[PDB]
Design a binder for this molecule. Structure first.
Ligand SMILES: *[C@@H]1O[C@H](CO)[C@@H](O[C@@H]2O[C@H](CO)[C@@H](O[C@@H]3O[C@H](CO)[C@@H](O)[C@H](O[C@@H]4O[C@H](CO)[C@@H](O)[C@H](O)[C@@H]4O)[C@@H]3O)[C@H](O)[C@H]2NC(C)=O)[C@H](O)[C@H]1NC(C)=O
Ligand SMILES: *[C@@H]1O[C@H](CO)[C@@H](O[C@@H]2O[C@H](CO)[C@@H](O[C@H]3O[C@H](CO)[C@@H](O)[C@H](O)[C@@H]3O)[C@H](O)[C@H]2NC(C)=O)[C@H](O)[C@H]1NC(C)=O
Ligand SMILES: *[C@@H]1O[C@H](CO)[C@@H](O[C@@H]2O[C@H](CO)[C@@H](O)[C@H](O)[C@H]2NC(C)=O)[C@H](O)[C@H]1NC(C)=O
Ligand SMILES: *[C@@H]1O[C@H](CO)[C@@H](O[C@@H]2O[C@H](CO)[C@@H](O)[C@H](O)[C@H]2NC(C)=O)[C@H](O)[C@H]1NC(C)=O
Ligand SMILES: *C/C=C(C)/C=C/C=C(C)/C=C/C1=C(C)CCCC1(C)C
Ligand SMILES: *C/C=C(C)/C=C/C=C(C)/C=C/C1=C(C)CCCC1(C)C
Ligand SMILES: CCCCCCCS[C@@H]1O[C@H](CO)[C@@H](O)[C@H](O)[C@H]1O
Ligand SMILES: CCCCCCCS[C@@H]1O[C@H](CO)[C@@H](O)[C@H](O)[C@H]1O
Ligand SMILES: CCCCCCCS[C@@H]1O[C@H](CO)[C@@H](O)[C@H](O)[C@H]1O
Ligand SMILES: CCCCCCCS[C@@H]1O[C@H](CO)[C@@H](O)[C@H](O)[C@H]1O
Ligand SMILES: CCCCCCCCCCCCCCCC(=O)O
Ligand SMILES: CCCCCCCCCCCCCCCC(=O)O
Ligand SMILES: [Hg+2]
Ligand SMILES: [Hg+2]
Ligand SMILES: [Hg+2]
Ligand SMILES: [Hg+2]
Ligand SMILES: [Hg+2]
Ligand SMILES: [Hg+2]
Ligand SMILES: [Zn+2]
Ligand SMILES: [Zn+2]
Ligand SMILES: [Zn+2]
Ligand SMILES: [Zn+2]
Ligand SMILES: [Zn+2]
Ligand SMILES: [Zn+2]
Ligand SMILES: [Zn+2]
Lengths: 348, 348
């Protein structure tokens, strides 16, 4: 047998030499060099020491600042809140495991690492649709006087906070199970085994379409509608109104965010799709570790985006960090506001 | 001429098109694309966001835990400080410099953006010698009844602070000078021009020898000593005493800590050396930017190593972070330390 299936796991290592042991009961150093595990352990650390201050940062700002209440603004708060969970929710454990060399918390732990990770990523994928929608509703405006209010925004927050939930939820209650991958440090869905007990079989097809293929379309498609309308080409202050040229930046951002997704996941979705269609092939632990751990940057490449492609936010952020005011720079140029300082509304 | 020497600088760009401007008076966007500076800018931000908590933490931790008082718990405590100094020291500036495309604070900026760096950079180097020796004195144990006291650790500290100071402070008072390098976002010593009025020539030698090659001897050699004695080959509980065992851990580390140095500084020291031995050839802004900005990771790659190759420190940290205690993990299986908990004195 190429790998070693346990009733709880599947080590991508042959037990010909009888050296394989449950990733729930002992270090997996026989899978790779111990310094290699120290490697994963640091990586995560950085992630935790980074993705934390930054995402927290975000929350605390949006909260404080009163004008930051646009769709985009509502989506990116979520993301920050989802990511705050991955980190404290599961990234922390992955570190634990890494620092030990195996899931010491056994299955409860893998159910953490797995759950959160899955959810947070699904949410990120879904949020990328609640967006395509809006982007379409503002660029191709199929309406007359319909505006995407904060109310429609909180809807998505629920929509996504649920759709992505009915994804990382089942493997915790009979439908599918979470199982360690690569060097047994990370946890994911079970692609490796058929395990009729939980029909890992059905659950995987359910997600390769209803939680991937579909959202992929929905987004790519909407990206087609705004092909003739707003494009990448966006001139200086205004293009048919600075309001029309300011929306083309919320759009030149969203695109990128999506890229940052199909780079953070396809490399993995591909690996996971190859292992499913070949549940037994001769693949090694390094095979799924790299594409998997790489996808964990997911918890950080979003605020960076938004903090570089959102004059509004970025300015409003430095205002928060410079304690008092000192907007310096060249302000948002357009709207600005905060908790009280420049929070003054000037709408209609 | 291949570059544009100014009375205060040296832009690695030809002024044949008369487009070159003082990096103390105008943006250097003609040297590279404006988004690249944005990169440096973005990057600089990630460094500060990570390096602060990580270094601040380490500080408050070494202080609260009354037993973390080994020479190592001194050299790194002093090492984390030297980094906080770089971070707020010149890291802040340099970001501000990348943000506005040029050294707005003129030379003043260049001097801090360049001092502190040279400062801490050296301390981390010297801090490695003050570690190599100590490692020698315990592994090849030169005395028959010697042991470094807290006083000695403070001597090293005072020492590395003198040695490093003895080379970062001179360029502030007439011997050589800090001049911006690469894209003109960072400052360093002058290898570029001979400037007789300041003696760049002489200094640069005094640095490549009395502060690099020689310390690079006092260390590698010392290692060739702990080759026959304590070796990277570290087993489990006890080696000839669980004491001798854990002695091996503090070494596998120092070694790594020395790797994480030659990695972070040779690529730069190399570039720096080539230029010197070619004060006038043709090289571009990117040339020294890369080695240079990568070297700045020196402000973090230490605590991460420490907090990973030190079960006791890691645990004291988990103990601290988990507000109360409950060091979960695996503890150190050996000694522990803190303030009111189990910082209980347990000698002989
Ligand atoms: C790969 O191939 C190996 C060689 O064929 C095979 O080896 C067997 O490994 C199992 C454990 O994985 C060994 O059984 C253990 O024996 C010890 C006695 O030294 C027991 O303590 C242990 O159970 C304990 O139960 C306690 C109560 O629950 C608990 O407190 C303890 O912590 C512990 O769980 C097991 O009984 C067995 O002797 C090995 N046999 C041989 C031939 O060496 C590997 O299992 C196999 N690995 C795979 C398939 O993943
Ligand atoms: C590269 O070649 C450029 C053209 O030779 C040259 O431009 C010159 O720059 C100086 C700036 O110091 C200008 O001088 C001005 O100085 C002050 C301004 O505050 C005033 O006395 C005057 O306005 C004065 O013009 C020169 O006018 C300008 N000459 C030009 C454009 O022809 C750059 O300085 C060169 N880059 C270098 C060597 O750093
Ligand atoms: C163990 O792994 C090997 C390598 O992946 C598997 O061998 C492949 O089997 C398929 C179908 O039988 C062939 O089409 C491939 O050509 C084989 N690969 C090669 C070239 O070696 C093998 O089937 C696996 N055995 C188990 C445990 O199922
Ligand atoms: C400008 O740079 C070029 C290339 O970096 C220099 O040309 C080199 O000159 C040295 C002698 O100083 C020769 O050994 C090399 O073979 C030359 N290479 C090339 C590409 O010609 C040139 O000297 C520099 N000009 C100055 C002096 O500023
Ligand atoms: C370290 C974290 C890991 C390996 C996280 C695992 C996350 C999942 C199993 C997520 C799954 C999917 C998506 C995010 C997009 C849609 C398709 C899935 C089901 C492969
Ligand atoms: C962004 C930070 C920078 C450019 C830091 C600059 C640091 C130096 C100029 C350091 C120089 C050297 C050492 C630390 C060791 C000894 C040899 C030198 C002179 C190349
Ligand atoms: C971030 C620096 C850590 C990554 C470099 C690996 C260095 S090495 C690694 O260190 C572990 C802890 O001491 C040991 O248990 C293990 O045997 C050893 O190979
Ligand atoms: C976008 C990245 C998608 C990656 C999917 C390509 C899987 S490629 C697959 O890997 C196996 C295990 O190493 C090999 O044994 C096999 O020969 C190779 O073709
Ligand atoms: C201290 C927070 C670091 C985040 C970096 C934000 C850079 S912000 C940038 O600054 C330029 C000049 O100062 C302005 O002209 C521009 O409008 C502003 O958006
Ligand atoms: C790892 C230490 C790095 C050693 C530094 C190597 C400097 S090498 C130098 O780089 C110039 C770039 O403009 C080239 O034009 C030139 O031909 C090349 O020899
Ligand atoms: C030893 C490990 C090296 C680890 C390194 C770095 C991990 C962190 C940074 C992630 C930032 C990604 C940026 C988003 C750009 C879109
Ligand atoms: C032998 C190697 C020691 C290696 C150590 C790892 C310690 C790592 C931190 C590097 C800082 C990375 C910064 C992210 C900025 C994006
Ligand atoms: Hg779209
Ligand atoms: Hg990514
Ligand atoms: Hg604001
Ligand atoms: Hg040594
Ligand atoms: Hg480094
Ligand atoms: Hg401790
Ligand atoms: Zn079962
Ligand atoms: Zn989902
Ligand atoms: Zn199947
Ligand atoms: Zn002069
Ligand atoms: Zn020095
Ligand atoms: Zn010279
Ligand atoms: Zn532990």
């Amino acid at each position: 047998m190429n790998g070693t299936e346990g009733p709880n796991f599947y080590v991508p290592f042959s037990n010909k030499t009888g050296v394989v042991r449950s990733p729930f009961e002992a270090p997996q150093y026989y899978l790779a060099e111990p310094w290699q595990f120290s490697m994963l352990a640091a990586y995560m650390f950085l992630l935790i020491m980074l993705g934390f201050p930054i995402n927290f940062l975000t929350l605390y700002v949006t909260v404080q600042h009163k004008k930051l209440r646009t769709p985009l603004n509502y989506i990116l708060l979520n993301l920050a809140v989802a990511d705050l969970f991955m980190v404290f929710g599961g990234f922390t454990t992955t570190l634990y495991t890494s620092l030990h060399g195996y899931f010491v918390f056994g299955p409860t732990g893998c159910n953490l690492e797995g759950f959160f990770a899955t959810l947070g990523g699904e949410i990120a994928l879904w949020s990328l649709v609640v967006l395509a929608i809006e982007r379409y509703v503002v660029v191709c405006k199929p309406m007359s006087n319909f505006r995407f209010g904060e109310n429609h925004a909180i809807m998505g927050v629920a929509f996504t906070w649920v759709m992505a939930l009915a994804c990382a939820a089942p493997p915790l209650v009979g439908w599918s199970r979470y199982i360690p991958e690569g060097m047994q440090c990370s946890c994911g869905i079970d692609y490796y085994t058929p395990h009729e007990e939980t029909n890992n079989e059905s659950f995987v097809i359910y997600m390769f379409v209803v939680h991937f293929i579909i959202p992929l379309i929905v987004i790519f498609f909407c990206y087609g509608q705004l092909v003739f309308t707003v494009k990448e080409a966006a001139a200086q202050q205004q293009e048919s109104a600075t309001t029309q040229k300011a929306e083309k930046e919320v759009t030149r951002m969203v695109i990128i965010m999506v890229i940052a997704f199909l780079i953070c996941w396809l490399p993995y979705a591909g690996v996971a799709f190859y292992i499913f269609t070949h549940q037994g092939s001769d693949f090694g632990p390094i095979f799924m570790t790299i594409p998997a751990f790489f996808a964990k940057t997911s918890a950080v490449y979003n605020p960076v985006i938004y903090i570089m492609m959102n004059k509004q936010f970025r300015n409003c952020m430095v205002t928060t960090l410079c304690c008092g005011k000192n907007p310096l720079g060249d302000d948002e140029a357009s709207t600005t506001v905060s908790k009280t300082e420049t929070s003054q509304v000037a709408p209609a």
